[PDB]
Design a protein around this ligand. Structure first.
Ligand SMILES: *O[C@@H]1O[C@@H](C)[C@H](O)[C@@H](O)[C@H]1O
Lengths: 6, 209
């Protein structure tokens, strides 16, 4: 994973 | 339960979540009021957002931009009842924001040049308490809000199967105030833990408070 969340 | 890691690049959830936090998200199988929820951004579902589920299907949500306080009337679609919401005394936060913008952790007795000290308080929505931050020199331009057809400015009636999201960094959060509701389909999951935190902030590893 490791995606971003704004 | 399936768990997905996420990094926090923005300050939209300060002081609950800081820039550099790596969180774990528990994917759904419904969010309760006050849940920290990750979801697919409605205007662009290719992007993931993390905010607090402040309004549930059927909620009358009102935000006073002056006092920066919410009023919630549940199950109203001549409302029936009001949700117990409380606010604590405003006090200096650990954070100073500079003015483009950036966040710094400055001792409450110290001052940063070209910066403003953020305020901190506790917001309770029914059963759940959390902190919010507010910029003393900031105030929403209500005219920039998403306006729900048929509704007055700064008041929203959450349609069935949808949610009202708001960030904890209240004056620094592009949320439901500006871009409307988050549909059920868009929900990714609930934030449960901080697995890792870079500036290494090992003291942050644990639960979300
Ligand atoms: O995805 C990252 O964080 C968001 C908030 C910024 O807009 C991007 O440019 C990246 O730095």
């Amino acid at each position: 994973x490791x995606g971003x969340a704004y | 339960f399936i768990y997905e890691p996420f990094q926090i690049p923005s300050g939209s959830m300060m002081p609950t979540l800081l820039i550099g936090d790596f969180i774990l998200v528990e994917k759904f199988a419904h969010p309760k009021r006050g849940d920290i929820v990750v979801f697919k951004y409605p205007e662009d579902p290719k992007l993931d957002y993390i905010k607090r589920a402040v309004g549930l299907p059927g909620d009358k949500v009102t935000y006073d931009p002056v006092s920066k306080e919410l009023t919630i009337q549940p199950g109203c679609s001549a409302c029936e009842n009001a949700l117990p919401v409380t606010y604590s005394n405003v006090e200096p936060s650990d954070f100073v924001q500079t003015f483009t913008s950036g966040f710094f952790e400055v001792p409450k007795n110290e001052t940063k040049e070209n910066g403003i000290r953020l305020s901190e308080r506790k917001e309770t929505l029914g059963d759940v308490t959390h902190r919010i931050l507010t910029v003393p020199i900031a105030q929403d331009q209500v005219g920039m809000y998403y306006q729900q057809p048929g509704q007055q400015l700064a008041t929203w009636i959450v349609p069935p199967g949808q949610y009202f999201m708001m960030g904890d960094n209240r004056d620094n959060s592009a949320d439901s105030r500006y871009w409307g509701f988050v549909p059920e389909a868009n929900l990714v999951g609930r934030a449960t833990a901080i697995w890792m935190s870079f500036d290494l902030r090992l003291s942050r590893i644990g639960g979300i408070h």
